[PDB]
Each structure stands twice: as C-alpha cells, then as structure tokens.
Design a protein around this nucleic acid. Structure first.
Length: 1326
RNA sequence: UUAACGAAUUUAUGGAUAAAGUUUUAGAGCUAUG
DNA sequence: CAATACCTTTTATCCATAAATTCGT
DNA sequence: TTTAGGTATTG
RNA sequence: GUAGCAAGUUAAAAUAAGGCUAGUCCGUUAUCAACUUGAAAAAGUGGCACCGAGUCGGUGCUU
C-alpha cells in the first residue's frame, strides 16, 4: 500500500514515500533513552546527508613515497656496507658522525663536525668545496688521490639523488659537441664511400640538429643545408636515425623485406646485425657513429651549456650557477648600496620579507623572490644586464630546485663512473666493487615485479626462485622475473562472468576463436528449392564449412558460402540464407597468423596439439619483453625449425577474451557427456545457441552454473564491484541501507513501486561565429560587433548563427528587441543549439503540433544549407530542419524523439536497479521465472527538473537543505505517474525482462512531448481526472492531487540526517613545525623533544570520548570531579582502545566511571535548551544543527526573484512571472525577518546578524533581482553545517564559530537511525 | 562496451621512479660600545 | 575566556588492468 | 581546488 | 643589548608515531547512530487510524 522514491547524489540520499493518492504519510515513533519524550511523530519523507567518499588514489600516492624512502636509505646503506670495512681504517666514527648530524650538540654522541671531527678541517672543506656540486667536479677531474670521506660524499650524493629513468640506453661525456660527433658520422660515411663522399663544409650542425622542432622538421633542415640529397637517401636515414625516427634502409639496398631500426625501441641491437650480415660488418662501424650522435642530440637540451673542459657537466652546470649568483649578488648588493641604500636592511636582513634574506633564510620561493624585486631592478641603472637575467628566469639561482627533475639519471652515472675510475688505482676495493656500486645507482625494481614481499603484502605478487634476501646485485638469480610479469597481468585480468572461478582465455586464443565461430554458425539456416522448410546447419556442414572456408580465408562472406560451399559441395544452384548478415562476424585470425608462420597445416589440426597451441598464444598475448617470451617458448623449440621460432617471438597479441577455458570445453553434461563446444557443433536438427545452452533446464549447464555463483556475495562486494566513482558508490550503499530500514518501518511489508534517480564555453561561442561569417564572407560581424562574455544569452547568440535573418521568414531582424521574437525548437519539446531556432513568430513553422512546415522550408531550404557549410548549424540541426521533405517527424521518427529522452543510459544507475530489484523479489513461483512483486524504476533527472519549473514547484539550493528530499518526493510522483498510465513503457522504464513494442505511434498519445498529462491546461485540453485506457484505474486528478504536492513541499518538518563518521586518515597536519616551547607539539621521532628539534601540530580527532572522573587542583592537589569531552586522535585511538582506563589515567584522569564513557563520533547530534540543535564538529568545536523552513511562497518567489537565467519559459507566462516579483515585493522584508527569529532562536550569533540587519537597511533602493540574490547568500549563515563566510553585495561577513563545547554536556544526546525515524535520546547528568 | 570488431578519451584499482618542500644540526660572523 | 586572525606539502614521469563513454568500421 | 578545524594572541 | 659591516647558493638526517609477520614488507581508501547477540561477518528490536502544521501537536480504538 505504499511506494518509495529515491534521489541519489554525491553527498545525499533523498527519500520520500507516496500513497495511492500521492500524500506523504506520517507515524508516531517510539523513543528510547532516559528522557521524558517517550514517543514522537515524524513525516515519512527525508534525505540523508554525508561527507563524500574518498578515493584510494591519494592514499596510494602516500604509499609510493613511503616505499621510495625506505628504499633510498636502503641504497645509501649499501654504499656504506661496501665502505665500512675500509673506511674504518681511515675514520672510526665518520658514519656515526653523519647518522647523528641532526642531533643537537647536547645529544650528540660524537664530534659535531661530520666530514672530519676537528673544527678546523671542516672550515677549509666548505672553504674549498662550497657546494657538493663543487666537490663532484673535482673528484671527476683531478688525478690526485682524494680522501675517502670526501669520495664517499660524492658517490652517496649521486646515489641519494639519481634523477630519472625516463631514458633506456646510455649517454657519454664525449657526446656533447654534436658537430664533433656529426663530423665523425660524416667522416665514416666518407671512409666507406668514394663515389658519393659528402662534405661537412659550413653546416651549422649544432643549431640545426638540436632544436624544439619535430624530430621530422629538424631532419628536413639538415638535408636542406647539405648539397642537396634525398631525405630518403642513405645519409638522411642515418641523420633520421639519431633523431629517433624509425628509418628504413630497404630502398637504399633494395632488400627483400623491410628492416627499420628505432633507437628507443628494444629491437635495435638485434636488428642491426640482422641487416648487417648481408651488408657486411664494415658498415657496422658507421651505425654506432650514428647512435653516438643520437646520444649527443639527446642530452643537447638537458645540459645546453658548454661542457668541453670537463667530464662532469652537471656539476660544471651547477658551479657556473653558483658563481653567477655570487657575481650578481654583489652587483645587486653593491648597486642597492650605491643609489638606494635605505632598503638594504629590508632586502638582505629581514627573513620574513621575501627579500634575498627571505629568499635564503625565509621560506620565499624562487618565484616569490623574483616577483618581489622586479620593481627594484628597474629603478636603478645597470639593471638591464641584471634584468635580462631576470626575464631569463636565471638569476641568483639555487643549485637544487624544482627544475632538476629534468636531468636523466644517466648523466649522474657518468660523474660517478668518472669519479670511481679516477681513484680506484688509489683504493683497491673500489676497483673490485666498481661494478657492484654502479648497479646501486642503476638498479630499479621493474614494475611488473611489484614490491618484493614475503607473503605479507596485499599488493605484492612477485615470485622468487630461492627464498634468500634480495639485493640490487643478485636480483635476477633470486627473483623470478618472468613468472612475476605473468602474475602481474593475471591479477588484473577479468574472470569468466558465467563461471567466475576460472580465468579468462586470451581473446586471440585458438580455442576461443573456434567457439566464437561455431556459435555464430549453429544459428545459420538455409532454404533451397528442394526443401519444404528452412533447416539448421547440421553437424557435418559446420564441420565441413569451417574446414572448407574458415581455414582457407581470413574472412568469410555470404556469397563465398553459397558459391564456394553450397553450389560447389552440395550442387545447389540457388539457396537463401536467413542465419547471417553479409559476412561471417567471427574469424580464425590466429589460425592463419599461426598457419603462415609454422607453415604446417597438419600441425594445426591434430587435437593433441591444441594444448601446445593455447600456450603459445597465452604466452604470446601476455608478454611485453622480447627476451622473456623466448625463455618460455624454448620448451617448444624442438617441434620447430629454427627459422619458424624466429617469426613466432615477433607476433604479439593484445587483448583478453570473455570466457574461461573450462566453460567452453571443460564443463560436461553429466547426462549427455558432451561439453559446451561439443553441443555447438553437432546438436542434431535442433541446433542451440550459447545462451540457449546455458539456459536449458533439461541440460546440466544452468544447474552447474548456479553452484559456482552462490559459493552470492555480501553487500559491499556487490556494491564495491560496481564501476564508477568511489563516492557515488557510497550514496548507493547508503541508498540501499535507506530502503531497507524503510521496509522495517512498514511492518516488514514490501512496496509496489520504487523510483530512483541520481544527479550528474565562453569563447567557444566567439569562434563558431568568427569562422561562419568568414566563409559566408558577410559583414554582419563587422556591421555590429559583440564580445566573448555576452553570448550566454541565447536570443543574442542565435541571431549570430542565423546571421540576422529568420530561418522561417527570410528577413533581417532588429538587434534591440529580441524579447518580441521567440526561441523555437525545431522539434516540439530539446533546449540545445542543435534543436533551437530564433524567429519573430514560432507559428510561422506551420502547425505547432507539426514539424517546421513545407511552407517555410521552401523559402529557406537554401538558407539552412548556407549555414551548414559555414558550420553555423550542425547535421542534427539541419536534418531536423529539412525533415518535412522526409514525410516529417514520422510516428517512428517521433518515437525516436521521446523514447530517447526518457530512459536512463548510465551503466552505474542501471546496476543499482538490479541491486534494488534483486533485493526485493526473493519469492519464486513454481515455474523458474521470477516473481516481480516489487517494481524498480530509473528516472532521468531532467524529467522532474522541468516539472518543477512547469508546475510551480521551483527549487532553490542554498536557502535550505529540504530540496533534497523534495526531489525524491517529486521523483516518486512523476515516476508512479508515468507508469500508472502506460504499462507499455514497463519494459523500457523498469528493470523487468517485460518487452515493449515501438510500433504504436494501446493507441495512447499522438503528441511527441511526454510530460503533458499532469497539466490541467496545456499549450496547444485535458480532463482533470485521468484514468488508464485499458483497466480503469484512476491515475491523475489535476484538481485533487496537486494540493497535497504543494502542501507536502510546504511541510515544515522533514528528516534531515547527516551521517556520523569517526574521522580516519592522516594523524595530523603534514608540515614540520619549528622547535617550540608548546605542549601541543607532537614529537616526530621519539628522542626529539620538539622543544629541541621541532615537531608536528594539529592532530586530527578520530572521535570524542566523554569522561566523568576526578582531577588534581592547586598546590593543594585536591580531587574534584569533572565531566568533559576528550579528543582521541587518530594516533591515539589505537593506544586508547587497548585499555581505555589506563590510557585515560595517563592523560590525567583519576577515578573514571568506566561505564559511562561515550564515544562521540563526528557530526554527533545534541538538542539543548529551546531545541536549537548542535552538531559536534570536534572535541572542542560545534557546528550548526537546524535548517530554517523558509515558507514555500518565498522559495518559489526567490527562485523567480533570483530571475534565473533571465526568462526561459513562454513569454505570456513571463508577464505573470515579472508581475509576481512586484506583487510579492514587500516579501524581501519578510524573508529577512524569517532569519532574525530563527537566528535568535537557533544560531545564537547576534554579533554577526547585526552587521547583516544594518546592511539590508542600506541597499533598500537597489533593484530587486540584484538585491534578492545577495539575500540568498545570507542563508549560509542560517544553514546547517559549517560556519563559513558569506558576503552581502559590498561587505564580506565572517563566520561565528563555537570554540567552546560545554553547552553539549548537559543537553540531550540524540542517536538517530539511517532514516532519522527510530531514536534513542539521552539527557546528560553527572 | 556494440545486433559485431576496432579506436580514443575519461575515471577507477595497481606498480616502478623522480625532483622540490619542511625540520635540527655542521658550514668559527667580525668591528667599535659595558 | 570568547573573539581574532592565521594556518593548512607539492609537482612531475613511466607501465599495467578495467568499466564506461563517445566516435569509427 | 577551497574546507573548516587548530592554534596562539589580544584588548 | 644597540649601533656599524662582512656573510648567504651546500650538505647530512627524518619524512606520517610506528608494527611484527623483521619482508629492499606494512602503516591515511572503503566500512560505522543506539540497545540485545556475536571473536567478527552479521542477525535481532520500535501497535494503528484520524484531525491538523514553524521543524510534529492533539484525539479515538487496541496496548
């Protein structure tokens, strides 16, 4: 006897309940707790507010670094382990001294100076190597033996910061002068070619080769410079090669098959010799010269500076940076003293300022310092040399900045290698471990491996050959690299939907292809002259045809079948095929790709070979890595000629299928003994399809299927599997929790109807007219100009696409009065530009029930075509405009019109329907078919949206939160209504498979716009009492039912519930905070008194706990009993739950009443005093609790007062809409007054209200549309939720926050249910 | 996901890396003047 | 106290898998 | 991308 | 301590406290009114009708 209407979003589930006659019911509810309120009445309408669900993404990102850091201290640790034994000879406590570098000297356990214990030698060190980058250049350049500590600092510093792995390959210090490298390339081609020598001449190889242009555009510029040679010529292919293009030398040598070579792709080292053996090995020397150039190009942008003197360009790059800063510092530092020496203290001494002193000592960014002194630079002479340095964005640069991520790790290795190479003569262990160290900088755990777990990671999948611990150096021997990469993909691969216990087969699987082929073929039927009736393909023909036609050719067309098989093999001269369209959809692409490679047709047909052929595709489809496939296939090498093997590694397959191996060939009917496949060929004269095979009660397949699936899943797994936003899933979980408690409410009775709905260019307008009057060539853009911000008004913008002439009358339109002109939809109500037109009168188009008439088209069938070529209209706009000459909107064209509009297309929402639909109908009748006890409906969001506008139930968001339920109410009404009149739409609108026929055009309705029947009076007659045509059920009364809808909207009591949530996540605000003598400073790691070292701050409060114990006071230390709110932080909560009391005593409580302790989750609910409500937003803060039920007349007024998007509706209706403003103009004083009684009652912020009251007084004479909108802001003051700031038109009003929580402790605590209806209240007394 | 195959973008889940930030210490502040 | 003002790590790169979405053949 | 809770200090 | 001036660009170390399963692992997502039951997963618990409407008020029958 009831129906539920849901309105789902990101932050709300809205829910209302409807009657046979569309009221919203009520009921008295029993109330628990020690309070005198023992029962209360509530309406059966509401919404459920919650904070949005959070993606795992941010979390997983924290995970990455968590991993990066525990692996970086690991890498530096490895270098120490190499050094430890040998460093100890030089310095006993060097490593210790660095470990404890961060400790204050009071806490230091060794000398304060790290590199060397003595004060004196540290001073010199920084004297001679101010930056590490200084030291690095020295360690690379000098031939002298350098101190081991110094050596260690260089290596570890490159190892701590490697730069990126975004190159695969290698790069050298020799490869910096591209010309020097270029000429060597030219030189080799010349020591090899005496008929066509080339000359280097005066080609600016350096400038041409390395520039921001395409890898292609640079290429053309090289060969342009030279004496004229073909980009296709050999030298161009080599120049091309370096540039990273794929160049094919086939045309040059006219080789039999094409062999291109790319230097980024893997196949380069292998391809070169495959080409090289035919060409001869002499030629090989050239290509390496060409690769070398590539490497010179590659780093040519990363270190643009000259690096000719040294083997350490990066550090050379830094050292030049450091000196320019020193140079430019003094030039600035002096020039400020020279002419403007008053500000110097502000710039260079005050840290807070964003001066240089701020730049270095303060936290100002390079960006902030540059901006701050650009004024000063251009107020003093000699600035310009300095300023061209600032506009360059290269001034007083730090060595280490955001920029450096650009550097490729390789360039660091070259400095480390060169450092190691230098000093290995002096220290033996370095020569031995040089290789072992280099792997540290070079090593990177490959992604397909995943984290190297020992079964203790959710995420990890890798596999190991030996259970021993993994170093960068033994990785290959312990880690099963390949079988890891299979596991890697296999976990993200789909399962088989029909039996989701077995993995999907590769889509290109040979078993898969056959199944996909035979299922299309079983349903093929042939009709011939001899036969009385059409007959299925029989068991032999499928088996013949496939051997005959599918093995011969990749794709099989129908004419191929009748001429190649039917006429040739059965000698039927004519036949007719019902079963398939113009060609067979399936194909055996692998058979042929496999047939052509192994070149053995016998090998493909022996069924004993199928187990071996599946594995080749599965390994072939799986693996990315050239090497890796081979380690797998080697088991098979014997079956095959070595040349056969070579082609197989090449073919790689992309994509995973739909179905399991087991389903197709493993499952077997206990009765028939035959598998799925074996029923797909040879089913006898009645030949069944795959769906039919699973859906045959007599066969074991439907029963065998059902067993795997139940073994189903709980709600979260059912809900979480859903595809879409992780947040809108939350509303779903809550939306279903909401229905289920609604069910509890109706005496455990189920509802008949359920209606669910979920909610979801400024310059684009300027460019589509710019180019559409450019190809029209018209001067209507020149005649009157407009701006880019203006065209969000339709009637202005539609004039411009039209060019000033009406598509219905062919005359020029006045610019000033578009008010008199109508916007016309090409098709009777679509609001897009595609279907909107502007003419003086919309009756010119013909009948208003008719498509734009033949009468107007004939004058302007040409104007609309002029507009299409100028992209001033679209194919959808035009094909609807001319549509009168295609018989107009056909009954079947009009069926496309409304049917497309109404049905929900979104795959998430659909799934929700199942979720509800399956959760309702548990009962099954004696037949297998389901009982549709409850009907689920999915409504588009627009349908209600226009109805509110059409039928005076206007929506304003920010006044209130009641509108959330109000859409749920309105969604239940429009829903139950559209299905009450038309069951023919039950199959379209409801998850229920019945079936609906398009043919009608059960006569129902002539007109194309669906939402008409509610209307008492409609724009060109309906009886006010509506009934279904076929059964006589009375469905809509235009007079009777409407009163209650406006009344229910108008209802002042709705259930608004904001879901209560223990706070999860990060412990505290992330920033490190400087040492302080505060007690709220959280220590970073144990031995660091934040007072000494700095610490954290601002912990997040997981939940509040109410305490009722005693405490010590004064030097007296007297015990007196306190009751208050304790803030359990996220860090604390783990510790708190183990022992509440011991933990409580440690925070200072004595004699806690253990039993009365209440954990108050966030958004917790209290009503105190006069029934104003407070939500606990923290242990120490509170949040607004009451929504102000603005009377319906004001909402409706304010929406029209707000004058949303000028006026969209019909213009005669608009004069009453404007009239309503003046008639209800005195309301503005009434609206403001509503707030005042409510603020004074609930908000208790009078401080603020006063600047408000003293502000509406001031702008009384300002217009209403402007005044009303600014009035709307205020409600955020009155709004449930957080104090946040709002502004009246000229004044910003700050928020009134509740920094004391005492008022709760003596109030009545409210626990409410998910609906809000069932409660337990608790009045608080110590 | 389509009446069927492909391509793309998006979002979701997952992996491997990078560069900045922040914090305490080390980078002997000197010269007049109590 | 309760106002008051102030605070709140970010920005890249590569690889995979999947739905869902809108194009194509 | 802006929220809305910490946090310390004032008249 | 106030005046004067020199100075500055780098480094090391930590990067959620930390946990045991000590792995070159894990540590911010989802999930949560209350009461009884449960290790948890979860299951259980709240008469109806009418008249009305400033955030639910009254009344009749059963209870």
């Amino acid at each position: 006897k009831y129906s539920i209407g849901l309105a789902i979003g990101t932050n709300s589930v809205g829910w209302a309940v409807i009657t046979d006659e569309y009221k919203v019911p009520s009921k008295k509810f029993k109330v628990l707790g020690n309070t005198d309120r023992h029962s209360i009445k509530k309406n059966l309408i509401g919404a459920l507010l919650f904070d949005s669900g959070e993606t795992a993404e941010a979390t997983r990102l924290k995970r990455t670094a968590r991993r990066r850091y525990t692996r970086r201290k690991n890498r530096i640790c490895y270098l120490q382990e190499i050094f430890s034994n040998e460093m100890a000879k030089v310095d006993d406590s060097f490593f210790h001294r660095l470990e404890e570098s961060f400790l204050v000297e009071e806490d230091k356990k060794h000398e304060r100076h790290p590199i060397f214990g003595n004060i004196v030698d540290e001073v010199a060190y920084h004297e001679k190597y101010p930056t590490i980058y200084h030291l690095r250049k020295k360690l690379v350049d000098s031939t002298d033996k350098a101190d081991l500590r110094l050596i260690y600092l260089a290596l570890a510093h490159m190892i701590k910061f490697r730069g990126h792995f975004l190159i695969e390959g290698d790069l050298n210090p020799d490869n910096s002068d591209v010309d020097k490298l270029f000429i060597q390339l030219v030189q080799t081609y010349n020591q090899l070619f005496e008929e066509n020598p080339i000359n280097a001449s005066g080609v600016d190889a350096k400038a041409i080769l390395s520039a921001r242009l395409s890898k292609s555009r640079r290429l053309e510029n090289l060969i342009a410079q030279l004496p004229g040679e073909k980009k296709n010529g050999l030298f161009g292919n080599l120049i091309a090669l370096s540039l990273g293009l794929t160049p094919n030398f086939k045309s040059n040598f006219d080789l039999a098959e094409d062999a291109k070579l790319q230097l980024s792709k893997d196949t380069y080292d292998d391809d070169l010799d495959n080409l090289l053996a035919q060409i001869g090995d002499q030629y090989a020397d050239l290509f390496l010269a060409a690769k070398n150039l590539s490497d010179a190009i590659l780093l040519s942008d990363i270190l643009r500076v000259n690096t000719e003197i040294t083997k350490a360009p990066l550090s050379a790059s830094m050292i030049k940076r450091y000196d320019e800063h020193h140079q430019d510092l003094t030039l600035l530092k002096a020039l400020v003293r020279q002419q403007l020496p008053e500000k110097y203290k502000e710039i260079f001494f005050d840290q807070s300022k964003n001066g240089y002193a701020g730049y270095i000592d303060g936290g100002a960014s390079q960006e902030e310092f540059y901006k701050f002194i650009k004024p000063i630079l251009e107020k003093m002479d000699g600035t310009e040399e300095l300023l061209v340095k600032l506009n360059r964005e290269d001034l007083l640069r730090k060595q280490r900045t955001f920029d450096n991520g650009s550097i490729p790790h390789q360039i660091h290795l070259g400095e480390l290698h060169a450092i190691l190479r230098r000093q290995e003569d002096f220290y033996p262990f370095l020569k031995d471990n040089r290789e072992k160290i280099e792997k540290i900088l070079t090593f990177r755990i490959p992604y397909y491996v995943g984290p190297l777990a020992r079964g203790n990671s959710r995420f990890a999948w890798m596999t190991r050959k030996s259970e021993e611990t993994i170093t960068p150096w033994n990785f290959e021997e312990v880690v099963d690299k390949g079988a890891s990469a299979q596991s890697f993909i296999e976990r993200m691969t789909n399962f088989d939907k029909n039996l989701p216990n077995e993995k999907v087969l590769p889509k290109h699987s040979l078993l898969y292809e056959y199944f996909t082929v035979y299922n299309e073929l079983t349903k093929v039927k042939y009709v011939t002259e001899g036969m009385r009736k059409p007959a299925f393909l029989s068991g032999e023909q499928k088996k013949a045809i496939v051997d005959l036609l599918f093995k011969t050719n990749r794709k099989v067309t129908v004419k191929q079948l009748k001429e190649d098989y039917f006429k040739k093999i059965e000698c039927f001269d004519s036949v007719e095929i019902s079963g398939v369209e113009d060609r067979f959809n399936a194909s055996l692409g692998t058979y042929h790709d496999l047939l052509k490679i192994i070149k053995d047709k016998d090998f493909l047909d022996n069924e004993e070979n199928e187990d071996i052929l599946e594995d080749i595709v599965l390994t072939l489809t799986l693996f990315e890595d050239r090497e890796m496939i081979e380690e797998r296939l080697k088991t098979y090498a014997h079956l095959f000629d070595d040349k056969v093997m070579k082609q197989l590694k090449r073919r790689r397959y992309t994509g995973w299928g739909r179905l399991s191996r087991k389903l197709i060939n493993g499952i077997r009917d206990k009765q028939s003994g035959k598998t799925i496949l074996d029923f797909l060929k040879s089913d006898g004269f009645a030949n069944r399809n795959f769906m039919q095979l699973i859906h045959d009660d007599s066969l074991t397949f439907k029963e065998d299927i059902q067993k795997a699936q139940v073994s189903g899943d709980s709600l979260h797994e059912h809900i979480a599997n859903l595809a879409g936003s992780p947040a809108i899933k939350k509303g779903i979980l809550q939306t279903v929790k909401v229905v289920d408690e609604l069910v509890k409410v109706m005496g455990r009775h189920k509802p008949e109807n359920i209606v669910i709905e979920m909610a979801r260019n400024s310059r684009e307008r300027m460019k589509r007219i710019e180019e559409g009057i450019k190809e029209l060539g018209s001067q209507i853009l020149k005649e009157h100009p407009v701006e880019n911000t203006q065209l969000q008004n339709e009637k202005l913008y539609l004039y411009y696409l039209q060019n000033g002439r009406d598509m219905y009358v062919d005359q020029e339109l006045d610019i000033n009065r578009l008010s008199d002109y109508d916007v016309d939809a090409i098709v009777p109500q679509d609001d897009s530009i595609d279907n909107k037109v502007l003419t003086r009168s919309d009756k010119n188009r013909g009948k208003s029930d008719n498509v734009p008439s033949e009468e107007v088209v004939k004058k302007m069938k040409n104007y609309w075509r002029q507009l299409l070529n100028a992209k001033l209209i679209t194919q959808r706009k035009f094909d609807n405009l001319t549509k009168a000459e295609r018989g107009g909107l056909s009954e079947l064209d009009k069926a496309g019109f409304i049917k497309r509009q109404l049905v929900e297309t979104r795959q998430i929402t659909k799934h929700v329907a199942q979720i509800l639909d399956s959760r309702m109908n548990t009962k099954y009748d004696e037949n297998d078919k389901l009982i549709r006890e409850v009907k689920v409906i999915t409504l588009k969001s627009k349908l209600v949206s226009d109805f509110r506008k059409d039928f005076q139930f206007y929506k304003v968001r920010e006044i209130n939160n009641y509108h959330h339920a109000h859409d749920a109410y309105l969604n239940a009404v429009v829903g139950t209504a559209l299905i009450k009149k038309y069951p023919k739409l039950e199959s379209e609108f409801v998850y229920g498979d019945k079936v609906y026929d398009v043919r009608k055009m059960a006569k129902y309705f002539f007109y194309s716009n669906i939402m008409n029947f509610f209307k008492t009076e409609i724009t060109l007659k309906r009886p006010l009492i509506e009934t279904n045509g076929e059964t006589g059920e009375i469905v809509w009364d235009k007079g009777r039912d409407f009163a209650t809808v406006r009344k229910v909207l108008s209802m002042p009591q709705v259930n608004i519930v904001k879901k209560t949530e223990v706070q999860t996540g990060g412990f505290s605000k992330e920033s490190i905070l400087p040492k302080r003598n505060s007690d709220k400073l959280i220590a970073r790691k144990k031995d660091w008194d934040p007072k000494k070292y700095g610490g954290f701050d601002s912990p997040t409060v997981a939940y509040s706990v109410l305490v009722v114990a005693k405490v010590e006071k004064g030097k007296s230390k007297k015990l007196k009993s306190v009751k208050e709110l304790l803030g359990i932080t996220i860090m604390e909560r783990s510790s708190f739950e183990k022992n509440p009391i011991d933990f409580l005593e440690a925070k200072g409580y004595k004699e806690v009443k253990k039993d009365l302790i209440i954990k108050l989750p966030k958004y917790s609910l209290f009503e105190l005093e006069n029934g104003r409500k407070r939500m606990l937003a923290s242990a120490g803060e509170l949040q607004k609790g009451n929504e102000l039920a603005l009377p319906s007349k004001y909402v409706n007024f304010l929406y029209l007062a707000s004058h949303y998007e000028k006026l969209k509706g019909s213009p005669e209706d608009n004069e009453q809409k404007q009239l309503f403003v003046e008639q209800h103009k005195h309301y503005l004083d009434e609206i403001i007054e509503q707030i005042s009684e409510f603020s004074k009652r609930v908000i208790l912020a009078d401080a603020n209200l006063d600047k408000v009251l003293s502000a509406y007084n001031k702008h009384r004479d300002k217009p209403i549309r402007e005044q009303a909108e600014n009035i709307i802001h205020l409600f955020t003051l009155t709004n449930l939720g957080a104090p946040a700031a709002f502004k009246y038109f000229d004044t910003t009003i700050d928020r009134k926050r509740y920094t004391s929580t005492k008022e709760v402790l003596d109030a009545t605590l409210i626990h409410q249910s998910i609906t809000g209806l069932y409660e337990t209240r608790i009045d608080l007394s110590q």
